[PDB]
Design a protein around this ligand. Sequence first.
Ligand SMILES: Nc1ncnc2c1ncn2[C@@H]1O[C@H](COP(=O)(O)O)[C@@H](O)[C@H]1O
Ligand SMILES: [Mg+2]
Ligand SMILES: [Mg+2]
Ligand SMILES: [Mg+2]
Length: 252
Amino acid sequence: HHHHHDDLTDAELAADLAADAGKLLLQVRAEIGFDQPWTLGEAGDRQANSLLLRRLQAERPGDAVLSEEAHDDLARLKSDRVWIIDPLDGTREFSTPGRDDWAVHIALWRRSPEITDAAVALPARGNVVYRTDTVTSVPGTLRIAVSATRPPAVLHRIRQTLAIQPVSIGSAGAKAMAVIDGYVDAYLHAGGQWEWDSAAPAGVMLAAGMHASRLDGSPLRYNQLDPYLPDLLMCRAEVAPILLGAIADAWR
Ligand SMILES: Nc1ncnc2c1ncn2[C@@H]1O[C@H](COP(=O)(O)O)[C@@H](O)[C@H]1O
Ligand SMILES: [Mg+2]
Ligand SMILES: [Mg+2]
Ligand SMILES: [Mg+2]
């Protein structure tokens, strides 16, 4: 009794869901294997989604769910609590032998509005789970994580004035966690993305006392009618002014 103020907290549930989906994805990878990457990716997406939706209905039956892998009935627009999930982020990388740059994203949005609780699993990295309740708090040259598939064109403009080495990595979750780890200084994206790509990484980023915003510096906004959310900057706080400034100056 009195577990907090099964019965998990929202953050504990986010972490457990991310880990559980992580393990299932690892099982799918081992069972289906890499002969047909399309088949492997589809199975991972579908099975992880099924697990997550089943558990969210069982354990949070009153909460809305927005998932990449399910139809969106928009009931969430009237809810005060919405899980925003990417059952497998970096499906491409998951489907490729030896790649560890893929993730599970589990975010809870609560009306106010904020991502209040979140977890990001990197299942191939020992199924590590970064979570909002346990994550902790000028360089002459910047390492910036960018998509290994569709890197943002805006990076080329800012590189005229800032010394930057782009670090190509798959998955939004993997790139955001690379910022937390200190493997890169920043993660920059533009050109398109969805709420579930950034919601859990943003929640973790902000809980770590780091910076997460749109490229124009405005807050990342979630549970919108159109869950397209095309650009982001996630980085150490001190680096934010430098990069947001360069982005802004690119429009001069
Ligand atoms: N230009 C884009 N438009 C829509 N979604 C994207 C775009 N670039 C990346 N994403 C998505 O963002 C996530 C991370 O992609 P990446 O960083 O390319 O591995 C994946 O779910 C991608 O499908
Ligand atoms: Mg996708
Ligand atoms: Mg996905
Ligand atoms: Mg994704």
